[PDB]
Amino acid sequence: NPKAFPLADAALTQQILDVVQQAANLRQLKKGANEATKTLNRGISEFIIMAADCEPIEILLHLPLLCEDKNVPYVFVPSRVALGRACGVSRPVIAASITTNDASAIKTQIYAVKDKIETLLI
Amino acid sequence: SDAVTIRTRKVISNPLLARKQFVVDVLHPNRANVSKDELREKLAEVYKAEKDAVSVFGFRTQFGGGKSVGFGLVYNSVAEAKKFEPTYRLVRYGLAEKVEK
Amino acid sequence: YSTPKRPYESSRLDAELKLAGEFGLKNKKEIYRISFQLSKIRRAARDLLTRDEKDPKRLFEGNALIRRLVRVGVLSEDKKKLDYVLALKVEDFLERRLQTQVYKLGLAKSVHHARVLITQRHIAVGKQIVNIPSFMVRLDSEKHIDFAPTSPFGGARPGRVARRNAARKAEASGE
Amino acid sequence: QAIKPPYQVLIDTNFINFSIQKKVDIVRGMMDCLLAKCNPLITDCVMAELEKLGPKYRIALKLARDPRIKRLSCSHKGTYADDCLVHRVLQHKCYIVATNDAGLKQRIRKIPGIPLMSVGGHAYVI
Amino acid sequence: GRVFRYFGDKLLISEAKQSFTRVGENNLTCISCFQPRLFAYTVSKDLQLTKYDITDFSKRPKKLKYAKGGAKYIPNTTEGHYDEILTVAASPDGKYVVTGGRDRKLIVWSTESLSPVKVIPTKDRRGEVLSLAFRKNSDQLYASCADFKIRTYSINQFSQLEILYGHHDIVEDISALAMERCVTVGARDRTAMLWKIPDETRLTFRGGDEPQKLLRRWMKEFFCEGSIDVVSMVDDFHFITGSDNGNICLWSLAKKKPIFTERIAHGILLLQPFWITSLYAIPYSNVFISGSWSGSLKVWKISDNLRSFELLGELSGAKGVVTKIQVVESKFRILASIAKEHRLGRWIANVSGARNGIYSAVIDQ
RNA sequence: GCCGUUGCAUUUUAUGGC
């Protein structure tokens, strides 16, 4: 029935958009459910961001099944326009993937976002 | 020769010494430690008196380069430069003989 | 600075080089002096855990000490309860060094390649060229760390060894 | 090595009788030379031993049953403070041993990566 | 100087002359109008600058001269633009007008014969020009740059003065007055900074008010601040900003917090508020004009005590993405650059009346 | 200035599509 769970609140959404902004600054970001599915195959994916205003929505339902197979966190965001904007990118991106790097300059922000997401998934 | 752009601030009319004191700012990107001679030339063309009616000194530059701040002087006449200036600056500018003793 | 209490002790001696292996240092003097400053803070850190709650000493000399740790870029703001201050450790001051932040921000492909790039009149953070590896970035200066206007990899000159390589081509192949 | 504050420490039998007879506290002494928040522990082997020193050492028992100190359990009837700890230090690599008994202390310097203590809260690294 | 022109009541808004011009360009990014006869300058994402005469208020802007570059000018010392031009600004002497964009250069143009009189390399691969603003009655160019910089030039001598650092994302908007100071935003850092050029200091004002506390307001009786899109300077002692959620924030130089914030202005349409895509004030006055792609320029009157502002009204004559607002006077002539998309190359959704051109609106008294 | 449409009859004025 809901099909839009979990959907994030306000300050977590802008927090995620800022983390995606520095992630696009550090080329540690994947753009597209095609690419995101490939990163879920290679096991390099930290977590997955999906949009809620994508028409249709059922093209994006494969990512929770593949993530729950791989035990990977995921949270919906309401805008695909702002989700495109946080990529340093001027046309919308429906879904983005966070890649794995322990040498990442922004790693603590990624662990805090995974703390909020993994808090919300339970 | 990189568009020197000599900037002046702190201009106060001082008629009792017949002068106008002001802080010379020398921006110099891609140019290092220009002169004392060219400075007296290029600030006398906004006051339009003469080169030897212009005194200047000071100038400890910014660290790294690209900015220089000194202290500049302009008078109303040539004879005022011979009376109101120090005796060694006129030798430095060339306007006098240093009687060595 | 201050020397540690025991100079040769097995689990600590190998713990030196795993710090020297990741960060790429040259002297345990540059390790011990970092612990020395962490020593002096931590004694003061335990002083304000004894006194009364909402002491203005615990406020003025506490929170400014807390905010300065946020200001240097070490204490994350979520742990801003003066109880993570005891849970600080050695690598976090090592992590805020100017050498290691170059490698994290692409651009260095090593921690040892970035060490050479500090001492060769390259990368500046503000408009000041920094050539000391321990410059301790203040977290408001991260996305200003960049190649210089001069000193190529930044352009407008290719440099004395690239110009000499250009010089060799003109004299034998050309004239 | 990968050991972080808050530290956890094991108080055996020889420790408390060197604390009171030198008038240095248990918890507040541990915060001194470890320089962080400490989580003390006592096992079932150690506490029931001090019931056998009972009529001469009520002082040590009435300090050990304070809620600053936590309860820890093992399940063997017949084990000691001496031998039960060595199995605890074996299968995990994240405890700190507090003692002064040399007969136990030589069983601690052999397993690498194990922090020791001293006369009552004046610490020493491995 | 302070606010002294009090004429918000004198504006006859309901019968303002509304007109529109279609032009031969796709996605005009900016418009800059000179006042000493009045001129106009337009740049588009079709690589073109076009010069109009607007001295006749009853007429639509007629065409004088136009210049379009091309792919000839690929290198960066070429005297022509080879990508999208993001901003344009005319000099206060009417002699020059400078353009720049994604080609990361600055080309100074002559107003007379429309010739490339100067090309300046920014010398950074991230030194993209975003907003050019001149000091009133001066020639000191303030250049917002995508490598988080502010670069200051002189026009008459074509030199470089100095650079300001400090921001954390791309500096979109900068506004200035006749004194030597400017307001900047960084547009994702969710702050704005005041810049004193000879003092070489900054005063940092902070947005980012959480709507969660506003939910507290929802218990007493919304949308996220994510991007401070525009900034404008009303007087030397106050200014304003425009956001990504309809909030328009009034700011005082003595107030770290917002001295006012207006809630949703151009409205919504889970739900999406419109972006504050344009914001231009009449200098030293109490009147300012905000614009969206929603189709109606909303104009507001500042109170006399500088504490709140009130609705002057709406002008519905301009459908499409308003990118830049110019206001000239003698009467008042309002021009607005309507493009099919947002300035930044951004995506726009389902816009009614997709058209490109210039909005004109004359208000008497 | 690409197309369509209307009043002046197209220059002029207003509107829809790419």
mmCIF file of N, CA and C in Angstrom, chain C residues 5-6 9-12 15 18 39 42-43 46 49 86-89, chain D residues 1 4-7 31-37 113 123-126:
data_model
loop_
_atom_site.group_PDB
_atom_site.id
_atom_site.type_symbol
_atom_site.label_atom_id
_atom_site.label_comp_id
_atom_site.label_asym_id
_atom_site.label_seq_id
_atom_site.Cartn_x
_atom_site.Cartn_y
_atom_site.Cartn_z
ATOM 1 N N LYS C 5 57.339 7.471 28.847
ATOM 2 C CA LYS C 5 57.951 6.889 30.032
ATOM 3 C C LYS C 5 58.877 5.726 29.691
ATOM 4 N N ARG C 6 58.529 4.916 28.698
ATOM 5 C CA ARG C 6 59.358 3.771 28.359
ATOM 6 C C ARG C 6 59.788 3.850 26.906
ATOM 7 N N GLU C 9 59.407 -0.834 24.072
ATOM 8 C CA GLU C 9 58.352 -1.678 24.628
ATOM 9 C C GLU C 9 57.478 -2.136 23.467
ATOM 10 N N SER C 10 57.274 -3.457 23.370
ATOM 11 C CA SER C 10 57.005 -4.116 22.090
ATOM 12 C C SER C 10 55.708 -3.659 21.437
ATOM 13 N N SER C 11 54.601 -3.673 22.183
ATOM 14 C CA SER C 11 53.302 -3.361 21.592
ATOM 15 C C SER C 11 53.190 -1.882 21.250
ATOM 16 N N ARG C 12 54.048 -1.053 21.839
ATOM 17 C CA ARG C 12 54.034 0.359 21.494
ATOM 18 C C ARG C 12 55.013 0.651 20.364
ATOM 19 N N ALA C 15 53.459 -0.151 17.208
ATOM 20 C CA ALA C 15 52.367 0.799 17.040
ATOM 21 C C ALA C 15 52.881 2.150 16.554
ATOM 22 N N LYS C 18 53.038 1.625 12.383
ATOM 23 C CA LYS C 18 51.723 1.609 11.745
ATOM 24 C C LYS C 18 51.103 3.001 11.740
ATOM 25 N N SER C 39 48.340 15.623 25.621
ATOM 26 C CA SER C 39 48.480 15.386 27.051
ATOM 27 C C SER C 39 47.985 16.576 27.861
ATOM 28 N N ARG C 42 44.168 17.065 27.964
ATOM 29 C CA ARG C 42 43.409 15.989 28.578
ATOM 30 C C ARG C 42 43.431 16.087 30.098
ATOM 31 N N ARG C 43 44.547 16.564 30.664
ATOM 32 C CA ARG C 43 44.580 16.911 32.081
ATOM 33 C C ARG C 43 43.576 18.000 32.397
ATOM 34 N N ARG C 46 40.006 16.655 32.360
ATOM 35 C CA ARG C 46 39.513 15.950 33.535
ATOM 36 C C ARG C 46 39.229 16.909 34.681
ATOM 37 N N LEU C 49 35.596 17.927 34.715
ATOM 38 C CA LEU C 49 34.664 16.854 35.015
ATOM 39 C C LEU C 49 34.502 16.640 36.503
ATOM 40 N N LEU C 86 37.276 12.865 26.464
ATOM 41 C CA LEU C 86 38.133 11.800 26.968
ATOM 42 C C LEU C 86 38.337 10.716 25.917
ATOM 43 N N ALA C 87 37.402 10.577 24.984
ATOM 44 C CA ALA C 87 37.494 9.485 24.028
ATOM 45 C C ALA C 87 38.256 9.891 22.774
ATOM 46 N N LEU C 88 38.951 11.023 22.823
ATOM 47 C CA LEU C 88 39.867 11.392 21.750
ATOM 48 C C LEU C 88 41.069 10.464 21.677
ATOM 49 N N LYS C 89 41.698 10.395 20.508
ATOM 50 C CA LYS C 89 42.874 9.553 20.352
ATOM 51 C C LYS C 89 43.901 10.223 19.451
ATOM 52 N N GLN D 1 46.279 -2.608 17.228
ATOM 53 C CA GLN D 1 45.901 -3.018 18.570
ATOM 54 C C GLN D 1 44.407 -2.827 18.740
ATOM 55 N N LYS D 4 39.865 1.115 22.435
ATOM 56 C CA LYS D 4 39.340 2.464 22.564
ATOM 57 C C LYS D 4 38.817 2.695 23.970
ATOM 58 N N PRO D 5 38.867 3.929 24.450
ATOM 59 C CA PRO D 5 38.025 4.316 25.573
ATOM 60 C C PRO D 5 36.562 4.195 25.189
ATOM 61 N N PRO D 6 35.678 3.809 26.119
ATOM 62 C CA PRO D 6 35.873 3.514 27.541
ATOM 63 C C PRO D 6 36.498 2.151 27.809
ATOM 64 N N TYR D 7 37.535 2.159 28.637
ATOM 65 C CA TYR D 7 38.248 0.934 28.944
ATOM 66 C C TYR D 7 37.467 0.084 29.931
ATOM 67 N N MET D 31 40.597 6.351 37.008
ATOM 68 C CA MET D 31 40.430 7.474 36.094
ATOM 69 C C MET D 31 41.690 8.319 36.021
ATOM 70 N N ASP D 32 42.606 8.135 36.970
ATOM 71 C CA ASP D 32 43.789 8.980 36.997
ATOM 72 C C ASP D 32 44.772 8.592 35.909
ATOM 73 N N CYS D 33 45.306 7.379 35.968
ATOM 74 C CA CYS D 33 46.391 7.034 35.065
ATOM 75 C C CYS D 33 45.918 6.425 33.760
ATOM 76 N N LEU D 34 44.620 6.176 33.613
ATOM 77 C CA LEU D 34 44.069 5.801 32.321
ATOM 78 C C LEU D 34 43.494 6.989 31.569
ATOM 79 N N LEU D 35 43.252 8.101 32.266
ATOM 80 C CA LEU D 35 42.903 9.406 31.713
ATOM 81 C C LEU D 35 41.607 9.389 30.917
ATOM 82 N N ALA D 36 40.681 8.496 31.259
ATOM 83 C CA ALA D 36 39.379 8.450 30.608
ATOM 84 C C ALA D 36 38.377 7.829 31.565
ATOM 85 N N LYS D 37 37.173 7.596 31.051
ATOM 86 C CA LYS D 37 36.136 6.960 31.849
ATOM 87 C C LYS D 37 36.352 5.453 31.880
ATOM 88 N N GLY D 113 49.543 -8.021 23.734
ATOM 89 C CA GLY D 113 48.435 -7.103 23.622
ATOM 90 C C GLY D 113 47.529 -7.023 24.824
ATOM 91 N N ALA D 123 49.166 3.255 36.303
ATOM 92 C CA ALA D 123 49.120 2.299 35.202
ATOM 93 C C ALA D 123 50.468 2.133 34.519
ATOM 94 N N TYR D 124 50.559 1.100 33.684
ATOM 95 C CA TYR D 124 51.716 0.806 32.852
ATOM 96 C C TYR D 124 51.228 0.099 31.604
ATOM 97 N N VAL D 125 51.814 0.448 30.464
ATOM 98 C CA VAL D 125 51.464 -0.159 29.185
ATOM 99 C C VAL D 125 52.069 -1.549 29.072
ATOM 100 N N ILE D 126 51.675 -2.254 28.021
ATOM 101 C CA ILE D 126 51.969 -3.659 27.810
ATOM 102 C C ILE D 126 53.449 -3.919 27.637
#
